[PDB]
From a paper:
The NpnN, Ap4A, Ap5A and Gp4G levels within cells are primarily maintained by Nudix hydrolase superfamily member Ap4A hydrolase (Ap4AH from hereon). Based on sequence analysis the P. falciparum Ap4AH (PfAp4AH, EC 3.6.1.17) was predicted to be an animal-archeal type which cleaves polyphosphate chain at the fourth phosphate from the tightly bound adenosine resulting in asymmetrical cleavage of Ap4A. PfAp4AH can asymmetrically hydrolase Ap4A and Ap5A molecules produced by PfKRS (and probably by other Pf aaRSs) to ATP + AMP and ATP + ADP, respectively. PfAp4AH folds into a conventional Nudix domain, with four β-strands (β1, β2, β4 and β5) sandwiched inside two anti-parallel helices (α1 and α3).
We also provide two crystal structures of PfAp4AH - in apo and sulphate-bound forms at atomic resolution. PfAp4AH apoenzyme (PfAp4AH-apo from hereon) and suphate bound PfAp4AH (PfAp4AH-SO4 from hereon) structures were solved using PHASER MR35 and one chain of iodide-SAD structure was used as template. There are four molecules in asymmetric unit for PfAp4AH-apo and designated as A, B, C and D. The atomic resolution structure of PfAp4AH-SO4 has three SO4 ions and a PEG molecule which arise from crystallization buffer. Global structural differences between apo- and SO4- bound PfAp4AH were apparent upon superimposition. Three major variable regions arising from SO4 binding and different space group packing of PfAp4AH were identified in loop regions L2, L3 and L5 and analyzed further. We were able to solve crystal structure of PfAp4AH in two conformations. These two structures were compared and global changes were mapped for understanding the substrate induced changes.
Author numbering: 5 to 53, 56 to 149
Write the structure that this text describes.
């Protein structure tokens, strides 16, 4: 079972079109893989040798954002997918930025970053499981 771990990093939206109803004030960091499928995902990476150690290191390497720049919230999820018919699990840990204006620094693994919401799932061509992830995360963040 191949294991990947990432941090689902959220921030507060800088603007809301509507400030009336029950709304989604939050948005998650998504990097666009520079190769192959050009996948959009949260920052993540392969376990080596704690899943959170993995998450924090790969998030650092992938975005330049260290653990001290964000607060790990009490929510997580595991997505199971088969890679070339080999069982894989990716666990994401919700974390919110302390500074809403923290700047993403990409490595050569990605070409683009966007802060998105669960409603933008299809536009970003996210698998139903990552959309589920975003949905649940928003449920948690807005409760």
């Amino acid at each position: 079972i191949i294991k990947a771990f990432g941090i689902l990093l959220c921030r507060l939206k800088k603007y809301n079109p509507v400030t009336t109803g029950d709304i989604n004030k939050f948005e998650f960091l998504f990097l666009k893989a520079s190769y192959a499928d050009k996948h959009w995902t949260p920052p993540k990476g392969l376990h080596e040798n704690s899943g959170l150690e993995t998450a924090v290191r790969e998030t650092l390497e992938e975005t330049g954002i260290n653990k001290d720049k964000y607060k790990l919230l009490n929510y997580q999820k595991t997505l199971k997918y088969n890679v070339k018919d080999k069982p894989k699990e990716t666990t994401y840990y919700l974390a919110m930025l302390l500074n809403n204006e923290e700047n993403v620094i990409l490595s050569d693994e990605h070409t683009d970053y966007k802060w998105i919401g669960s409603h933008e799932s299809d536009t970003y061509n996210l698998p139903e499981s990552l959309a589920d992830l975003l949905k649940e995360a928003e449920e948690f963040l807005n409760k």
